[PDB]
Amino acid sequence: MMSGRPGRVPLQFLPNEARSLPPPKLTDPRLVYMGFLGYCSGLIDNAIRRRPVVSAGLHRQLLYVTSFVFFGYYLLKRQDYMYALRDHDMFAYVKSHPEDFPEKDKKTYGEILEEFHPVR
């Protein structure tokens, strides 16, 4: 779908047109879940390595957390930019092809005859 999109330069995680969108907030629920994933990784690291799972290596658990949040922020930016691109192309295509997307003639339920099915 999006592979051969025009202007799509290779090996570029965020293109420069993404800087027009709002960056994700720092307390973004998805970013906080990223940090939680890092914290779980640190706890499981203590468990497998046979260390006290909660209080051993606070620097290591902390680094797990911050690296997970660091990757999550950029992942969120790229995801949001891809969805913005999707909506951008969809609206452009609906605009360029009005015949494929007609203006449906709206009618009220007072003139629309819906069939009644009794429950009995």
Partner 1 sequence: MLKIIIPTTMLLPMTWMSKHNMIWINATVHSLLISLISLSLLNQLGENSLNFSLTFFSDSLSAPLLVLTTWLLPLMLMASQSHLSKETTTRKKLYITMLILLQLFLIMTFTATELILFYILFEATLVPTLIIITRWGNQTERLNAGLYFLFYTLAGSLPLLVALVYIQNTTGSLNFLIIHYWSHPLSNSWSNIFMWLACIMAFMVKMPLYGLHLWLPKAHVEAPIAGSMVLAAVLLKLGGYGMMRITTILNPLTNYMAYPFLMLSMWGMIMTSSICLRQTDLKSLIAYSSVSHMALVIVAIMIQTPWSFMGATALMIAHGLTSSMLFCLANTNYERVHSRTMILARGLQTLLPLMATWWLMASLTNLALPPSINLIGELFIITASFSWSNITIILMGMNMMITALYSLYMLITTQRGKYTHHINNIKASFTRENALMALHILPLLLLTLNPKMILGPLY
Partner 2 sequence: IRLQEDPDPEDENLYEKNPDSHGYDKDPIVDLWNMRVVFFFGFSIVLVLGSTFVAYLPDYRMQEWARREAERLVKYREANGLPLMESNCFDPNKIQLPE
Partner 3 sequence: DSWDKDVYPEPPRRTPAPAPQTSLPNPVTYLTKIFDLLVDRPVTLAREFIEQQHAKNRYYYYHREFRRVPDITECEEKDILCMFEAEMQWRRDYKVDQEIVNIIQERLKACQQREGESYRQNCAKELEQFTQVSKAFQDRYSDLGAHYSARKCLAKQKQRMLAERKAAKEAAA
Ligand X SMILES: CCCCCCCCCCCCCCCCCC(=O)OC[C@H](COP(=O)([O-])OCC[N+](C)(C)C)OC(=O)CCCCCCCCCCCCCCCCC
Ligand Y SMILES: CCCCCCCCCCCCCCCCCC(=O)OC[C@H](COP(=O)(O)OCCN)OC(=O)CCCCCCCCCCCCCCCCC
Binding site residues, ligand Y, CB under 6 A: 39-40, 43-44, 47, 52-54
Query: How many angstroms separate the CA atoms of 4 and 16, rounded?
Result: 18
Nearer to partner 3, 59 or 107 (CB): 107
**Binding-residue pattern over the window 12 to 51 for ligand X, x denoting contact by CB under 6 A:** xx-x------------------------------------
Helix (H) / strand (E) element for 82: namely: helix 58-96
**Residue 117 contacts partner 1 per CB under 8 A:** yes
**Residue 48 contacts partner 1 per CB under 8 A:** no
Q: 25: left (phi > 0), else alpha (psi -120 to 50), else beta?
A: beta
Query: How many angstroms separate the CA atoms of 43 and 25, rounded?
Result: 26
**Residue 87 contacts partner 1 per CB under 8 A:** no
